[PDB]
Each structure stands twice: as C-alpha cells, then as structure tokens.
Design an enzyme around this catalytic site. Structure first.
Site, mmCIF file in Angstrom:
data_model
loop_
_atom_site.group_PDB
_atom_site.id
_atom_site.type_symbol
_atom_site.label_atom_id
_atom_site.label_comp_id
_atom_site.label_asym_id
_atom_site.label_seq_id
_atom_site.Cartn_x
_atom_site.Cartn_y
_atom_site.Cartn_z
ATOM 1 N N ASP A 152 -4.476 6.009 0.368
ATOM 2 C CA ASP A 152 -3.732 4.793 0.076
ATOM 3 C C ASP A 152 -4.359 3.610 0.823
ATOM 4 O O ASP A 152 -3.992 3.296 1.957
ATOM 5 C CB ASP A 152 -2.256 5.012 0.464
ATOM 6 C CG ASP A 152 -1.358 3.837 0.112
ATOM 7 O OD1 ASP A 152 -1.863 2.755 -0.289
ATOM 8 O OD2 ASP A 152 -0.125 3.993 0.268
ATOM 9 N N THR A 153 -5.284 2.924 0.167
ATOM 10 C CA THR A 153 -5.988 1.808 0.802
ATOM 11 C C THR A 153 -5.054 0.618 1.067
ATOM 12 O O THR A 153 -5.361 -0.223 1.929
ATOM 13 C CB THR A 153 -7.242 1.390 0.007
ATOM 14 O OG1 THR A 153 -6.897 0.997 -1.328
ATOM 15 C CG2 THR A 153 -8.246 2.563 -0.096
ATOM 16 N N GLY A 154 -3.921 0.550 0.360
ATOM 17 C CA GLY A 154 -2.917 -0.497 0.610
ATOM 18 C C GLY A 154 -2.006 -0.276 1.809
ATOM 19 O O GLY A 154 -1.151 -1.108 2.114
HETATM 20 C C1 LIG Z 1 3.860 3.812 -0.829
HETATM 21 C C2 LIG Z 1 2.959 3.965 -2.062
HETATM 22 C C3 LIG Z 1 3.130 5.347 -2.691
HETATM 23 C C4 LIG Z 1 3.218 2.885 -3.115
HETATM 24 N N1 LIG Z 1 3.044 1.524 -2.543
HETATM 25 C C5 LIG Z 1 1.634 1.128 -2.446
HETATM 26 C C6 LIG Z 1 1.199 1.067 -0.981
HETATM 27 O O1 LIG Z 1 -0.245 0.972 -0.935
HETATM 28 C C7 LIG Z 1 1.881 -0.065 -0.218
HETATM 29 C C8 LIG Z 1 1.381 -1.481 -0.548
HETATM 30 C C9 LIG Z 1 2.072 -2.522 0.315
HETATM 31 C C10 LIG Z 1 1.349 -3.198 1.296
HETATM 32 C C11 LIG Z 1 1.943 -4.150 2.114
HETATM 33 C C12 LIG Z 1 3.283 -4.439 1.953
HETATM 34 C C13 LIG Z 1 4.011 -3.782 0.971
HETATM 35 C C14 LIG Z 1 3.418 -2.822 0.153
HETATM 36 N N2 LIG Z 1 1.677 0.202 1.197
HETATM 37 C C15 LIG Z 1 2.629 0.566 2.051
HETATM 38 O O2 LIG Z 1 3.812 0.744 1.803
HETATM 39 O O3 LIG Z 1 2.106 0.742 3.381
HETATM 40 C C16 LIG Z 1 2.948 0.871 4.523
HETATM 41 C C17 LIG Z 1 2.251 1.850 5.448
HETATM 42 O O4 LIG Z 1 1.280 1.067 6.149
HETATM 43 C C18 LIG Z 1 1.781 -0.273 6.245
HETATM 44 O O5 LIG Z 1 0.830 -1.242 5.816
HETATM 45 C C19 LIG Z 1 1.287 -1.913 4.632
HETATM 46 C C20 LIG Z 1 2.796 -1.718 4.579
HETATM 47 C C21 LIG Z 1 2.993 -0.407 5.339
HETATM 48 S S1 LIG Z 1 3.993 0.411 -3.239
HETATM 49 O O6 LIG Z 1 3.620 -0.893 -2.757
HETATM 50 O O7 LIG Z 1 5.320 0.743 -2.838
HETATM 51 C C22 LIG Z 1 3.824 0.423 -4.845
HETATM 52 C C23 LIG Z 1 4.496 1.318 -5.685
HETATM 53 C C24 LIG Z 1 4.294 1.298 -7.068
HETATM 54 C C25 LIG Z 1 3.399 0.374 -7.624
HETATM 55 N N3 LIG Z 1 3.171 0.310 -8.960
HETATM 56 C C26 LIG Z 1 2.746 -0.527 -6.793
HETATM 57 C C27 LIG Z 1 2.947 -0.493 -5.414
#
Ligand SMILES: CC(C)CN(C[C@@H](O)[C@H](Cc1ccccc1)NC(=O)O[C@H]1CO[C@H]2OCC[C@H]21)S(=O)(=O)c1ccc(N)cc1
EC number: 3.4.23.16
Lengths: 99, 99
Positions: free
Chosen positions: A25-27
C-alpha cells in the site's frame, strides 16, 4: 519481483512464524495489521485514514518477511479493513513505483 | 520514471484544467479526488478504509493526465483529505511496483 496493478497487490508475509496476506500500500505511511498478539512493549497511538481516526497499538522493531525480503520496523495493530504494508517497510525491502 | 517511497508518492495530475497533487496509491482500488464539481452523470457510493466509510460520487470515463500520461476512467469524488490515484488508472499509465 515486478508487480502489476490489475489485481490488488496482495502478498504473503511471515511475522512471528505466522503467515498472513497483506496489501502493498504505497498510499500508507505506516504498516497496520489486523488484531493479533505480538510480544514486547507497545504504545497506544491514534492514526487517521480516509474514514477518520482509529486507536492502534504500536510495536517497534518487529521482523516481517515480505515476499522473502526481510524488514524490521514499526507495526501498528488495529481495526484496518485489511493488513497493509506501508512505506516504512516498503522502503526497507527496496520497493519503488515505476512507469 | 522511478519513484522511491522515502516520501509520499505525490505527483501532479490534471483534470479538466485543474492541476492537483495526488498519491500514486497501490492500496486504492479506485481513484478518489477531493470535493470538486465534475460534469455529467454520477452515482452515489460508499468506500471504506481506516476509520470507516465515506460517501462519494462515482463519475465514469473522466480523462485525467498523470505526469504527462493520458488516463481515462472511473473517478470517485468525495471528502477525502488527499487526492488518490488508484489502481484503475495506475494500470493505464503503466505503473508497476518493483523490488
Ligand atoms: C486502507 C486501504 C485498504 C484503502 N485506502 C487506501 C490507502 O492507501 C490510504 C490512502 C490515504 C492516505 C492518506 C489519508 C487518507 C487515505 N492510506 C491509509 O489509510 O494509510 C494510513 C496508514 O498510514 C497512514 O498514512 C496515510 C494515512 C494512514 S483508502 O484511502 O481508504 C481507499 C479505499 C478505497 C478506494 N477506492 C480508495 C482509497
């Protein structure tokens, strides 16, 4: 390996001799795993995602093997919809995005 | 190019002459952008992640340019804190994970 994105990048990880499926999960800044027992001291933390904030337990210096690449780092344990491997560990195993 | 994961993989995207910064996110099934007023038909959807679910609007066949690469596909719009390029468009610009 090289991993394409027509499917979710789910991979097998080994942690504490247990095998689990986790999402590359690069996000995600951080690695968060579903409820499990890890040893050692943990600290209560809170983290925010797309839907709000959750409470997690933060364990430091945990070994995880991801596709046979070794990492040792911070693992959060809490209510995530799926096990996620974030950038803190993705960097250790040498993972990049390429297009 | 090659994007390391030392920092958030933010890149410049263009959608109808608005330029925005967005995450190249392998953990996102579908692209989700911050609240904005796109033309055309849409459908309500709930998407879930860390912290729970948010309500979004799904628009179809929306062209986006990502770092000079053309993409066209589903774009969800809702109250996300960050703009997210998900797998549905990552594949179109030829983006892979490599380690
Ligand atoms: C949790 C995943 C299965 C899904 N998420 C993508 C994810 O990459 C998010 C993307 C993301 C990024 C920043 C803010 C909100 C969401 N990251 C995330 O929740 O990361 C958390 C853990 O490390 C921290 O750094 C970022 C937030 C924390 S998601 O944003 O909820 C998501 C779900 C479904 C879709 N279509 C698009 C995005």
């Amino acid at each position: 390996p090289q991993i394409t994105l027509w499917k979710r990048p789910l991979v097998t990880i080994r942690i504490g001799g247990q095998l689990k499926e986790a999402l590359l999960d690069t996000g995600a800044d951080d690695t968060i795993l579903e409820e499990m027992n890890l040893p050692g001291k943990w600290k209560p933390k809170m983290i925010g995602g797309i839907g709000g904030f959750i409470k997690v337990r933060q364990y430091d210096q945990i070994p995880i093997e991801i596709c046979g690449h070794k990492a040792i780092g911070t693992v959060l344990v809490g209510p995530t919809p799926v096990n996620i491997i974030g950038r803190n560990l993705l960097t250790q195993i040498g993972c990049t995005l390429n297009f």
